[PDB]
Design an enzyme around this catalytic site. Structure first.
Site, PDB file in Angstrom:
ATOM      1  N   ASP A  92      13.239  11.172  -4.630  1.00 43.26           N
ATOM      2  CA  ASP A  92      14.203  12.127  -4.114  1.00 43.26           C
ATOM      3  C   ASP A  92      15.503  11.973  -4.895  1.00 43.26           C
ATOM      4  O   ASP A  92      15.629  11.121  -5.782  1.00 43.26           O
ATOM      5  CB  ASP A  92      14.395  11.949  -2.606  1.00 43.26           C
ATOM      6  N   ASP A 257       5.844  14.177   2.807  1.00 42.30           N
ATOM      7  CA  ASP A 257       6.086  12.736   2.825  1.00 42.30           C
ATOM      8  C   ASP A 257       6.697  12.388   4.173  1.00 42.30           C
ATOM      9  O   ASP A 257       7.366  13.220   4.789  1.00 42.30           O
ATOM     10  CB  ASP A 257       7.034  12.281   1.706  1.00 42.30           C
ATOM     11  N   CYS A 295     -12.433   7.210  12.213  1.00 41.99           N
ATOM     12  CA  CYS A 295     -11.669   6.890  11.012  1.00 41.99           C
ATOM     13  C   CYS A 295     -12.515   6.019  10.089  1.00 41.99           C
ATOM     14  O   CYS A 295     -13.133   5.055  10.544  1.00 41.99           O
ATOM     15  CB  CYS A 295     -10.385   6.158  11.405  1.00 41.99           C
ATOM     16  N   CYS A 297     -11.241   4.303   7.504  1.00 41.29           N
ATOM     17  CA  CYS A 297     -10.427   3.353   6.763  1.00 41.29           C
ATOM     18  C   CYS A 297     -11.015   1.944   6.836  1.00 41.29           C
ATOM     19  O   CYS A 297     -11.819   1.607   7.713  1.00 41.29           O
ATOM     20  CB  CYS A 297      -8.984   3.360   7.277  1.00 41.29           C
ATOM     21  N   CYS A 300     -10.662   0.227  10.305  1.00 38.03           N
ATOM     22  CA  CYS A 300     -11.572   0.648  11.366  1.00 38.03           C
ATOM     23  C   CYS A 300     -13.019   0.234  11.090  1.00 38.03           C
ATOM     24  O   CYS A 300     -13.836   0.200  12.025  1.00 38.03           O
ATOM     25  CB  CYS A 300     -11.438   2.167  11.569  1.00 38.03           C
ATOM     26  N   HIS A 326      -4.107   1.448   8.504  1.00 38.10           N
ATOM     27  CA  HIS A 326      -4.871   2.478   9.194  1.00 38.10           C
ATOM     28  C   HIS A 326      -4.084   3.784   9.298  1.00 38.10           C
ATOM     29  O   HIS A 326      -4.636   4.869   9.076  1.00 38.10           O
ATOM     30  CB  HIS A 326      -5.286   2.019  10.596  1.00 38.10           C
TER      31      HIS A 326
HETATM   32 ZN   LIG Z   1      -8.646   3.507  10.575  1.00 32.90          ZN
END
Ligand SMILES: [Zn+2]
Ligand SMILES: [Zn+2]
Lengths: 360, 360
Positions: A92, A257, A295, A297, A300, A326
């Site tokens: 930025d 963002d 999820c 990820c 998880c 996560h």
């Molecule tokens: Zn997750």
């Protein structure tokens, strides 16, 4: 061979678009979520952030100016070396944190101007550079909003020229302009025309997510985004909650963002398809399911609500690390489902399904 | 006011005793388990070790000689300052690790003798000092065991005299002698008589827990411990598993040390009243019960088998820290149940109940 900046739209549904931004340091899948980066033990590892799905991260120019400073980052090889992140980085302008002397020249507080902001972003070596603008307050008098918009456009021209004056920056980075005008359609149109006349690689919708609430933010997006050039990326800065993101994509936004995944993770809050949860709540102490049932990820795949609950309640930093990983991965999976559903022409249905379940 | 070394027996049952050793740095409840200490991030905090119930810890003289060295520990203020442990510390002589020149003078490898071992233990500033002896191998020929016993007794006298030559050590610390003689009752009796003639504050039964198995260790204890002075503490060095400890107390032992709780904790193994468990086993991945159902250590008050399983399987150092804390606390709770059951005259029944359940 890799181009400086090439935006391609692969599929559309209504105002929503999905595609790619190709840059020299990599490809950015759009609509994109950019996690807000920091230096590379007190943060996630950059390989962890990459593995969540992020194609690009954001650097906060104002904080980097204060510590360790832009010249110091340059001497260390630039922001990519400093952050251990070799893919694209957006910075930025530093101007919003200044608000969060004050003449047409710029500001002193350290000094910032269109020219100095562009120079600092060149010292950082970022791939996407934001023009330096003036943030109209919230709420803004029709007088104050007209003033800050017109100054922003003169400063957008100065940003353009500063960027173009360095061959190394102009040949290797991209420059985004920022539309202003608050909630005033005629001002937004004047701003858009000014930026299109100057010419930028992408365009951000400024003056939003500053306390106005979602309904008003959406109303402004409804007429502001169509004013920007269709064939360039549209960036909504500092947004936001998952439902903010979905509705902004419905209105033509390509890039986002937010510190929200990190702030939430540090506060023991996890995003899920069923809404956010407070992992400290007693209901999770014996819950062997992952943070989110769907999820994929890395967290998880291994960790249960019960054990993340235990880590957070003990104040173990691992707990906050897992939550943050996560949350950032959840955001990337949201963007992926958005991209997939636009490609398959079922994004409007995706958005309705998402809202019905997220707020149930 | 606090005495140098005062052993009081409060209650007896058969050969088992319970009581206290009062020293200037604190009171030691007996029968006692002494965790084996190390320097004070890669180890448990000393306040954590204290909170498990430990009244005294052991320092390994040989390892301290090699790093950072005894003179360096003295310059840092002594072993108590070095380890952040202000309660009593026992040090071994360093002689066993030497085995694990070699004349009657001592050994070079660094040099160790009765005199130098006592001097190093004074530099460490420990409260209980072990005499320097010669370890008979296992198994030992009746010839070799006779040799190492007789040398040990001459070295026990030299240890006595070295200790008594430093007023600061002799007025503030205590000295233990070590009985040798392997499995030969007549040798054990000769050794005991020699040590009693010299005179020590406490007496250890050496030459055991070196591969001989529990039945033979118990057979040797059966006749060796009655030979030592009744009114001084009896120390079985480097023992051991919980059932080793219980049976050694049945045979008159008052003091124990072992790295087993730490080694087990680092290897993902927890002691329980139902026997040891391997926390990596799949049966624990969803087990919400603590490591041991009845353990009141700080770990079992908060952490489940499932979450310690998760930490260990991920290789998180917190997992090994929690396991180690629980194992050392479990050992202290074993000693407390031993002490309580002797005081109440139900220790023989405690031992039988313990074995029936631990091996079920
Ligand atoms: Zn997750
Ligand atoms: Zn426990």
């Amino acid at each position: 061979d890799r181009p400086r900046f090439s935006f391609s739209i692969a599929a559309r549904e209504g105002k929503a678009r999905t595609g790619t931004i190709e840059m020299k340091r990599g490809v950015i899948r759009t609509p994109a979520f950019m996690p807000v980066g920091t230096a590379a033990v007190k943060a996630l590892k950059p390989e962890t952030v990459r593995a969540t799905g992020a194609d690009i991260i954001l650097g906060n120019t104002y904080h980097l100016m204060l510590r360790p400073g832009a010249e110091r980052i340059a001497k260390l090889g630039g922001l990519h070396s400093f952050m251990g992140w070799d893919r694209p980085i957006l910075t930025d302008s530093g101007g919003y944190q200044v608000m969060s002397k004050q003449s047409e020249e710029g500001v002193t507080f350290h000094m910032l101007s269109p020219e100095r902001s562009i120079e600092i972003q060149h010292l950082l070596g970022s791939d996407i550079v934001m023009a330096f603008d003036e943030s109209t307050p919230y709420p803004a008098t029709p007088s104050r909003a007209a003033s800050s918009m017109e100054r922003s456009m003169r400063w957008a021209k100065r940003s353009r020229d500063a960027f173009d004056s360095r061959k190394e920056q102009a040949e290797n980075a991209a420059l985004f302009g920022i539309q202003q005008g608050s909630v005033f359609e005629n001002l937004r149109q004047q701003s858009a025309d000014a930026l299109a006349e100057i010419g930028f690689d992408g365009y951000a919708v400024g003056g939003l997510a500053v306390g106005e609430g979602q309904d008003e933010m959406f109303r402004v997006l409804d007429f502001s985004v169509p004013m920007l050039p269709d064939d360039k990326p549209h960036y909504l800065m500092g947004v936001g909650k998952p439902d903010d993101i979905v509705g902004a994509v419905e209105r033509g936004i390509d890039m986002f963002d937010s510190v929200l995944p990190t702030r939430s993770g540090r506060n023991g809050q996890a995003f899920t398809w069923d809404g956010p949860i407070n992992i400290r709540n007693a209901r999770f102490s014996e819950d062997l399911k992952p943070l989110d049932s769907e999820c994929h990820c890395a967290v998880c795949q291994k960790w249960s609500r019960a054990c993340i609950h235990a880590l957070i309640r003990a104040g173990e930093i691992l707990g906050a690390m897992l939550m943050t990983e996560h949350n950032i991965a959840f955001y990337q999976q949201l963007m992926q489902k958005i991209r997939d559903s636009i490609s398959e022409g079922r994004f409007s249905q995706f958005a309705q399904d998402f809202r019905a379940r997220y707020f149930a």
